[PDB]
Amino acid sequence: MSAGVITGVLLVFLLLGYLVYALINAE
Amino acid sequence: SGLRPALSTFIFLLLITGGVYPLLTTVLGQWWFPWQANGSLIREGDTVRGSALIGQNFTGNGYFHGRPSATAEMPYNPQASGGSNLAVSNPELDKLIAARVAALRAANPDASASVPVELVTASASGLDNNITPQAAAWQIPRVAKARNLSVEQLTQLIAKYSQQPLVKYIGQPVVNIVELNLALDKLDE
Amino acid sequence: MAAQGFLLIATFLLVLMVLARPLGSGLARLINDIPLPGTTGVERVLFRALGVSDREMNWKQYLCAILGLNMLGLAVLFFMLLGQHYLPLNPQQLPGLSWDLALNTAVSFVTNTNWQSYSGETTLSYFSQMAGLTVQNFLSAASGIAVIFALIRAFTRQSMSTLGNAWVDLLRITLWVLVPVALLIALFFIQQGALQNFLPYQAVNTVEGAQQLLPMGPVASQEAIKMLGTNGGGFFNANSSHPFENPTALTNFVQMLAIFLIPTALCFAFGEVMGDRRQGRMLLWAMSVIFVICVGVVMWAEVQGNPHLLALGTDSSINMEGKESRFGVLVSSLFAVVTTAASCGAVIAMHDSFTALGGMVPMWLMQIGEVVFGGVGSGLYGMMLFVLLAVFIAGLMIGRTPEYLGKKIDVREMKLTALAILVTPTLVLMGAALAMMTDAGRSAMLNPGPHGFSEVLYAVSSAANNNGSAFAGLSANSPFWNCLLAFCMFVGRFGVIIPVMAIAGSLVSKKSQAASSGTLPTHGPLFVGLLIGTVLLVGALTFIPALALGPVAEYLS
Amino acid sequence: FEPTLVVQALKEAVKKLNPQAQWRNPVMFIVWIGSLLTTCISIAMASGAMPGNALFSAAISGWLWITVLFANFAEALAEGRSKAQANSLKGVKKTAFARKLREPKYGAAADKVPADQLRKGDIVLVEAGDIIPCDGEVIEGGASVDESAITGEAAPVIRESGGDFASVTGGTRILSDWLVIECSVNPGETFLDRMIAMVEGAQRRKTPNEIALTILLIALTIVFLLATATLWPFSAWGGNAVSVTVLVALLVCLIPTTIGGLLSAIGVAGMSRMLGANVIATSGRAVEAAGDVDVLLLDKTGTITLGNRQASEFIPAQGVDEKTLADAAQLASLADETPEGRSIVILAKQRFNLRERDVQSLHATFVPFTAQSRMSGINIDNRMIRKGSVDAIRRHVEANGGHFPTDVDQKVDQVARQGATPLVVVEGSRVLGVIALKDIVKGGIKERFAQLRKMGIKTVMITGDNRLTAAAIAAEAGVDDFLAEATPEAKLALIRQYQAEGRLVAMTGDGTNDAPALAQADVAVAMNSGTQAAKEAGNMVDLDSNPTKLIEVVHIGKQMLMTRGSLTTFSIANDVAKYFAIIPAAFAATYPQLNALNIMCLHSPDSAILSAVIFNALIIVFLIPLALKGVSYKPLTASAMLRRNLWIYGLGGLLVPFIGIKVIDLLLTVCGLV
Ligand SMILES: [K+]
Description:
The complex is a heterotetramer of chains A (about 25), B (about 190), C (about 550) and D (about 675).
Chain A: H1 5-24
Chain C: H1 2-32, H2 40-50, H3 59-82, H4 99-109, H5 126-156, H6 166-174, H7 179-192, E1 202-204, E2 212-214, H8 219-226, H9 249-273, H10 277-295, H11 298-304, H12 307-311, H13 330-341, H14 357-368, H15 378-398, E3 403-404, E4 407-408, H16 411-437, H17 439-442, H18 450-464, H19 479-508, H20 525-548, H21 551-556
Antiparallel strand pairs in C: 1-2, 3-4
Chain D: H1 4-15, H2 19-22, H3 26-47, H4 55-79, H5 87-94, E1 98-101, E2 110-113, E3 123-125, E4 137-140, E5 143-146, E6 156-158, E7 174-177, E8 180-182, H6 191-200, H7 208-234, H8 244-254, H9 257-273, E9 279-281, H10 284-289, E10 293-298, H11 300-304, E11 310-315, H12 322-332, H13 339-351, E12 365-367, E13 375-380, E14 383-388, H14 390-400, H15 406-418, E15 420-425, E16 434-438, H16 445-455, E17 458-461, H17 467-477, H18 488-500, E18 504-508, H19 515-520, E19 523-527, H20 532-536, E20 540-542, H21 550-582, H22 605-627, H23 638-671
Helix pairs in contact in D: 1-4, 3-4, 3-8, 4-9, 4-22, 7-8, 7-9, 8-22, 9-21, 9-22, 12-13, 21-22, 21-23, 22-23
The structure holds potassium ion.
């Protein structure tokens, strides 16, 4: 059982996607 | 899509570099260098006594014990071609090398106080038919006492079956175990 | 043994610089699109017969052509490995490989990565090795040298709208650049002892009474492209340590020369086609300093060797449980640094049994991105991405607009270079992390302690840096491991290649600007120091904890 | 320093930053997420969780919120006034007070109505000295309205009725007379609303250096997030794994927040240093971008002109003399409140030193600028002083019945082609002369424009005024190729064209006309002699009347680009050294034998990473004093200047992180907070 491990993985994935989005588009 | 400029180009590249290249290289090798291109085998009679590159087990006394193999199924298995991938900090390597150095000390009681590193540490491919001259000369007296030979003619035998590189720094001088053992078997009679 | 390494490095570097210049000039002719002498008419007849003719294409057409050829070769190799039973030339009726191993090998022998997870004596047949795998190495090397030819043409072309012709370039690459050198080194391999026949497996009766079965196959025809194209997967489980594979230290020298021959020839070609050899010598000096200092430390650690062996009764404490005796320990360390720098998976020696520091430094050059004397085409555009990195780092350090080689660089190139640089650290970190989550990958341990995690990190980095080298003993026959490495190799090489065509297309459309006050001089020791500091420190930024929790932990403990 | 009231209102605007707008800045928003997670784990510790240490995470969350608050503080100090404001246009739209009619007549039933009362079909009168409520058409009567928003010229224009000149856009001040206007244009989408559509919608594009810095921040942040994220599964092979709160602390400490603070510290230092050239700079990004400009758009009336139109010379006919029209002009400008009339008085004393013509002792019967005759002046008992434009002169000649002076006509159209607006007087029969009212050039701007030409700035003059006098002013000022008779939408289109060409564009003006041009300009300079709308829009307001302040603006922009490169050197080296400085603290917890990698022998990893948080909070604060009072300011060549910069600031960016972490940990150890 992942008490917070899977939540951490999802947070890292979403944050990396947001970082790639900010790399593509100059905010 | 791709069409002809993709498909015909790929077929031409596949044909040239898969039929023409290996066919021509095979023809050149068989026409020029047949003994080298056939595996450098030793063919005494119709029975193969071995090949001059791989190396064999040589577990008997007076047969110039070679480098450790540590292959997959059996020692010095040529079809496995693996190596002892044990790490520095792995205690399994330490237990294996302790057992092997104990066996080497039991087999050779007065060869030297120390032991060569290459005669007790396993080779990379598991098949090493070559030994440095100092490690080959470390085991002179045991083989001499086993085969009733003299250290003089033994060390000229080691020197005569020695391969030396073109330059010193490119590698190490070596001797071949299999050819030396077959020379010993020929010197039996 | 201290000075022997210096003489070996000096001899290798001098013979490399001697051999590079004619191939560099020929490759520069390939960028310049002038036909090679003696091949002017026959190539025209061949192009007319094939139907490629002459058709200038832009970066999008080039990119989809290269990836379409790679994907078609991937499908061909996948089906060919799947149907191993029906194919001819099977002296032993070997079973067809599983779907996971077939997909792994199919995506591996394409895209230059050439990772191996099997033993070819018991798994791979003759006809797959003879036909499919050799032409896949050929096509991977040709694709890498074509993509770097496109990047160089984009740099040297001013105010144009095209890059060249894909299949024309690939034909002119692999018919007259790889094949003659392959003959000239394959005949040397046969001379010093190799296998280029089609005999079945031969029984051998030893003097001990224990018979064995000799491996069999066309070794030299695969050697002459595995070393030349920096692929790194052979017939045997030992990539370059088997006696039938690599016979003699003289052939080891020829293998080293073949591994570094193509990238430094590309660097000399780039310098010659730029009009000034200062750029070429600048990149080669920047790679040579890293190569020299990193063959160092590795050599010292390997001659320091096992601390237990000195106290256990051995006269010499030299690290020797992972190497052979025909080639020693110093040449073993040199080849290890060469193959971990050039994205070639060919191991002269068992990398898993090295000393911690002398395994971490080749793993350091493994992790960094295969940019120092790198791939058959991969290393040069890796260096071009990192020198563009250094150019705008200097531009933002200087407070003016950054331009390279007289060409202005803007935000689209900025983003695409950032993605191309950071795609491989992302993969080599996230895939390794996912491997340490799963109990299946953690079930593939061989060495307990931090060395198992080091083995996992090496495997994932070999996948996503397109190398093929491995700490052996990893049970990579698992479907999870095979699919993870397969995906890593695929998305790694192609997500590097696609931004390279993006940069090339965005640089074709521009024009070479004149001299300006804010233009950074793109040569000199200052720029070498800036570029090496840039690549080494970004690699440090993304790889300090991964190396620290593994081999550095093993060294300290 | 800045005044306390504006920094307090700005700090209120800083506290107004929500997560809905926090993701504009990526590194600071990632610090914000890390702060939210460490605050959540701190209140979980307060409620009870698996570990036992709570005050350490509480201090991390508090100092992280201080870091976020100060970073947003500096960001609002730099670009809280960068957005173009349309408060003057909104106020002049909302003042309303229209005079509504229910019957079209000069008097009738008129009442005060707001702006929303107007609709499709309405009758509103504007009398004298009021504001037009909305765009519409003239029903009857004549009006002299000041085209301030259109063509940017303070000279009044007559409209009348029953002709082609019935279009009153609204918002233009009526000078005199009276007018009845039919509301044909609805409330909304009128002329002023079409102006405010892109006065409100400015959206200035980001400078290339700022975009490249943001891309570098994204790259380094991806690197550091990658490392801190893969640290969690890589520690699962150890005896004890890394903690989630200390991993969050590493994630918020490693990322280059120093350069993100620098991104606005440069602007804060720019607004501080702009007071040396006496310019109120509302945003520092334009001050930074001033060093990369290539063109300069300019408005004639107000920026190149002194403002009001001056008098050049009295041109008489052959039958009259200089005194014989100078006395008539002096009489015509006796009871004249116009600055043009004051200029007539000044030229009268410049020529004749004329006296004893008192404004009230002489029975000066003042006739104003008539709606139906367009004639104005002063009547005495035996002499009828009137003056006006040439069409009104010809109408008066037709009314009298006399022969027309075509010699006066060729004189006035010759001086009109020269670039002067004629003003013909009527006394002494029809053979009296004209006043040449021409545009006037300011104090020696031609040499400064030649300096701009030498520097590389292309000066293009666009005003919307008459083409002949615009070309004359461009020739007199040494301006390059120019545009005339241009709408504010045409000025917007020119700004968009110069932005799409790639080069940065600078626009300077004073009027309401070029408020969209100042809103869309990259480095926009207002004028203190102009209206409130131009000062509200744009990024810079000139304190003096000097139009060629852009020389000093570009000089300080180049100097501060150089110091921005120096600070970027220092910040990049600082972040790179800080990574190595605080990276071994992640290894002592999960592995005992890597404490020898700790180098400095830090007291504890928690103390080291808390010291990293303190260094994070302190470096962005100390950047502004380091942004002020720079060291290197003289230009060199590229390679040598980069060498000097890299030396002098890489030594700083290496020594400051190690010294700072060691000093803060020593302070924490002697304070006993660990
Ligand atoms: K690559």
